[PDB]
Amino acid sequence: FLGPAVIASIAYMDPGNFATNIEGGARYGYSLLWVILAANLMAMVIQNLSANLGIASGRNLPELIRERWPRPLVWFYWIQAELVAMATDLAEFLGAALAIQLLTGLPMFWGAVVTGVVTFWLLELAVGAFVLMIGVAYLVQVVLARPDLAAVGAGFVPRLQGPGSAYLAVGIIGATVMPHVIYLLNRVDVIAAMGLAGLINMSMLAVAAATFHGKNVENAGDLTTAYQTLPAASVLFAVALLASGLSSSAVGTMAGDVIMQGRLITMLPAFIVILLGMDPSSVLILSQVILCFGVPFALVPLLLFTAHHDVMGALVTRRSFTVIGWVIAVIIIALNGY
Amino acid sequence: DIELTQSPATLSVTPGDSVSLSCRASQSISNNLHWYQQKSHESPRLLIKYVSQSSSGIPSRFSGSGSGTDFTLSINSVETEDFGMYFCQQSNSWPRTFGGGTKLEIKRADAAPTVSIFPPSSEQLTSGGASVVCFLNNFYPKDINVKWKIDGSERQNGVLNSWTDQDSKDSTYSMSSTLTLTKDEYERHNSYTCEATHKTSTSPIVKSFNRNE
Amino acid sequence: QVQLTESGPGLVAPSQSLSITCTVSGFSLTSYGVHWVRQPPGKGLEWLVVIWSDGSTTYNSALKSRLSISKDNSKSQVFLKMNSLQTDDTAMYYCAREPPYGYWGQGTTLTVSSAKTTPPSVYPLAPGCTTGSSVTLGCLVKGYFPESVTVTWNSGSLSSSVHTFPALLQSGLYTMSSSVTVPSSTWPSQTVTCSVAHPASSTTVDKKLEP
Ligand SMILES: [Os+3]
Ligand SMILES: [Os+3]
Ligand SMILES: [Os+3]
16 A cells, blocks of 8 residues: 555665665575564564553653663663664665765765765655665566575575674664664554565565576675666666665664754764775675664563553563574674674 | 577688677576687686676677677687687576587588498408498588498498597598498398488499408 | 686496585685586586585586585585486586686596496408509407597508597497508508507507408
8 A cells, every 4th residue: 555665665764774685695595585584573573562662651762761770771771772873874874875976976985975965955755756666676576586496495494504694694684673663553554564565675685686696796795786687777776775875864863863862973983984994885784783783772671661560562472582582693693703 | 497599500610700609598588698618628718798798808809799588699800719619608597508509610612521431340250240431531511411321221320420520630521430230230231332422512422342252 | 826626537337426526726615606517528518506605505407316516615625426326427527616607627527337447459441442542541449448549550651641530439338430541552562550559458459451
């Protein structure tokens, strides 16, 4: 319908999910699609538990964690959440820089200046039409190859152990369960939005795995080589990226104002790109595992606050196993990070 | 399951005139295709990636042109170092599929075979064998229909043809065709005719011997 | 200098097992997928299988459930392996790996037949009565295994021209034609003898050719 589709295209609209559902297809092919499944399901749990708690004993999570926790722990959770929104804005400026260099070819510094003056410009239907049009653009090839061979033969979970194998999956599932959706008639619109746009992500990844897996060539991490051919569809990919970044800017920075009030300070990572010693293309995926490390700190308070003062949320089945599986995975990739 | 029929199967050139290989597809495969050169007993280095972009470390002589359901490689001024095999590989979908291949060869003026038919060897006769080889030395082009006749009746089977590579001395092909027989097959009959229908003669070149004398 | 090298050639009986080592150098094997390409003696070729690094085997439907591909990152070797029945698939195998392809190995020869080592039987081919001023004489190596005999002609016939047609399989063994030509003014005045060298059986047969 016209509601959940726009709510979905806007709901994802970040460079991180583009830049990790196009790495999983270039290295771990269809065998990674499953995580995207697990990426949405628990997420559709979590936000529901936020909608299940956001009206009863009404307050956003930053208002709650200031009510009954020690002060040093409040400073620690503000370090954690501020590094979370900081890393999200790093994702915004990075992806928008790669987009501006993907269009006019401007250096990422001048691209960051243009994103600064677009932050000046911020003070809708066309953006959702761009992410909707690239979303249908990846629904052009959601049909395209071996529907029962590589697909369902890889949606069943593999226990792969390698550093990059679990690192990239942790980046994907750490980018989908965005920490700022946890800081929050309505349930159906979001279950269908995240539902269909889950097909946008499985489409993006599967097409990223069928477009070139065994072909080798230049890696898909740059996103400059991510323009798939059916000419103008490439510029459509770059404009879709730029729109996704510029909108995730306002949404994630206003959300950072919600977590922060209860501007340029998050722009310091935005110019770490000038370090020149390492290329930015794949520090965005890291930007989604660091963002992943800020998820348990955003999940424990919901899990514990859900069952005291309020009705509903008595179910503690999958919603509590997901946090311990989550933390054991991120402690696998964190305890092997040396 | 997509295939790639490649034509022409073999190609002769002077060298000088431009050649153009065709790698027809079974369905559309976009610009996912690879062109390889090959020599005898060698590893095939890559020439053309994606049919448009020339690959790394490849002379500007070669150029791939095409779009969609069929693609064509093209060599301009063959330069005596482009002779031999050429293979063509799609890579979009499992399984990857190579083409039918082509063997580029040197071209020159025509020639006629110096056919000579031999009786079975005296030692092979008491060994039980009865091979009647029929050499067809120095002929052009490569194609010949050599044929055997045992008492007029043709012998399409029991034969064995063999072909040399394009001769080093003068770019001229030669072949052999053994007609191995058992004892009764060699004793029941009376004569063995070795014919060769060829482009340079409407009448096939003929040699024969008979069991007596 | 990026470079791939393979294991030495192999000759195995039917229903035996075998393995081949595609070792790599000059690039990061853990970062590239290796394809396998099989070329019969001269009968074209078709894509075989691909082993993506970190063990990801994908076999084509043509050669599924017989072939297997091991990998060893400790020495960056890509192992090919064939077990089960062998049914005399005889060919030279290839491996490939580099972002656009174009770095293939030197290839490895692999022959399957049950025949034991047998020295040849050289059969002289006398014309039996002579078109023109030059006469052709023949020599027939036959029934040998393994491959590759080298036929050499002694003559002294002033003008002469030798040919040696490629070895071909007959009933599990090998057969070969061998030509020579002499001015007939020296035949049979000057002898023109046909030696045949088969190093795998040590035997060399210096067969004289007479009518
Ligand atoms: Os207060
Ligand atoms: Os409590
Ligand atoms: Os076959």
